[PDB]
Scaffold this active site. Structure first.
Site, PDB file in Angstrom:
ATOM      1  N   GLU A  35       0.841  -1.212   0.000  1.00 29.01           N
ATOM      2  CA  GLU A  35       0.000   0.000   0.000  1.00 29.01           C
ATOM      3  C   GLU A  35       0.871   1.254   0.000  1.00 29.01           C
ATOM      4  O   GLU A  35       0.559   2.220  -0.736  1.00 29.01           O
ATOM      5  CB  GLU A  35      -0.892  -0.007   1.238  1.00 29.01           C
ATOM      6  N   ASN A  46      -7.780   8.760  -5.741  1.00 34.30           N
ATOM      7  CA  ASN A  46      -8.610   7.797  -6.502  1.00 34.30           C
ATOM      8  C   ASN A  46      -9.382   8.527  -7.594  1.00 34.30           C
ATOM      9  O   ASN A  46      -9.619   9.727  -7.490  1.00 34.30           O
ATOM     10  CB  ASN A  46      -9.535   7.056  -5.555  1.00 34.30           C
ATOM     11  N   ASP A  48     -12.405   8.627  -8.314  1.00 30.20           N
ATOM     12  CA  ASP A  48     -13.709   9.123  -7.802  1.00 30.20           C
ATOM     13  C   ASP A  48     -13.531  10.381  -6.943  1.00 30.20           C
ATOM     14  O   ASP A  48     -14.585  10.910  -6.483  1.00 30.20           O
ATOM     15  CB  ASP A  48     -14.454   8.032  -7.025  1.00 30.20           C
ATOM     16  N   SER A  50     -11.909  10.545  -3.999  1.00 29.66           N
ATOM     17  CA  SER A  50     -11.473  10.137  -2.640  1.00 29.66           C
ATOM     18  C   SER A  50      -9.945  10.044  -2.652  1.00 29.66           C
ATOM     19  O   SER A  50      -9.362  10.069  -3.716  1.00 29.66           O
ATOM     20  CB  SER A  50     -12.106   8.863  -2.169  1.00 29.66           C
ATOM     21  N   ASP A  52      -6.514   8.084  -0.513  1.00 27.56           N
ATOM     22  CA  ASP A  52      -6.027   7.058   0.425  1.00 27.56           C
ATOM     23  C   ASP A  52      -4.828   7.641   1.179  1.00 27.56           C
ATOM     24  O   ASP A  52      -3.946   8.302   0.571  1.00 27.56           O
ATOM     25  CB  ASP A  52      -5.551   5.829  -0.333  1.00 27.56           C
ATOM     26  N   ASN A  59      -8.983   4.944   3.025  1.00 26.78           N
ATOM     27  CA  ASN A  59      -9.724   5.780   2.049  1.00 26.78           C
ATOM     28  C   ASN A  59     -10.705   6.756   2.711  1.00 26.78           C
ATOM     29  O   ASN A  59     -11.480   6.358   3.612  1.00 26.78           O
ATOM     30  CB  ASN A  59     -10.410   4.868   1.051  1.00 26.78           C
TER      31      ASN A  59
END
Ligand SMILES: [Cl-]
Ligand SMILES: [Cl-]
Ligand SMILES: [Cl-]
Ligand SMILES: [Cl-]
Ligand SMILES: [Cl-]
Ligand SMILES: [Cl-]
Ligand SMILES: [Cl-]
Ligand code: NA
EC number: 3.2.1.17
Length: 129
Positions: A35, A46, A48, A50, A52, A59
């Site tokens: 990650e 992301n 969309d 969002s 992380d 998220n």
């Protein structure tokens, strides 16, 4: 902060992640490696909108507030900035909520794709824990 492998294993064990929801420490170390590469300050946007955050790339869609993810929740009741600290306490506490949510560590797509079913004990091999 960029952790070493065994340094992160030790910190995750100190915060009670080892065998949490039945997931051995090597699962957690492997997830963090893919990650964030063990970097607490990792961020990734992301498609969309969002974001992380942190060592386990938690998220903003569900788990933390960053003020810029419309319609999102903050189920860990933390600013997403808290997930970027040198101290992993907020990331671990929030990860315990995520892995309790019903799909276990599949919530971490990189864990499903790169850690699940592999020799995850290699990630804590040699570590004084
Ligand atoms: Cl490594
Ligand atoms: Cl393990
Ligand atoms: Cl928001
Ligand atoms: Cl919320
Ligand atoms: Cl906040
Ligand atoms: Cl820590
Ligand atoms: Cl599970
Ligand atoms: Na949010």
């Amino acid at each position: 902060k960029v952790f070493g492998r065994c340094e992160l294993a030790a910190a995750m064990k100190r915060h009670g992640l080892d065998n949490y929801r039945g997931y051995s420490l090597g699962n957690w170390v492997c997830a963090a490696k893919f990650e964030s590469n063990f970097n607490t300050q990792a961020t990734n946007r992301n498609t969309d909108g969002s974001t992380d955050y942190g060592i386990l790339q938690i998220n903003s869609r569900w788990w933390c507030n960053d003020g810029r993810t419309p319609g999102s929740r903050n189920l860990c009741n933390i600013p997403c900035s808290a997930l970027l600290s040198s101290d992993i306490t907020a990331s671990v506490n929030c990860a315990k909520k995520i892995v309790s949510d019903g799909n276990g560590m599949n919530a971490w797509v990189a864990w499903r794709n790169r850690c699940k079913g592999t020799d995850v004990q290699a990630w804590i091999r040699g570590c004084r824990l």
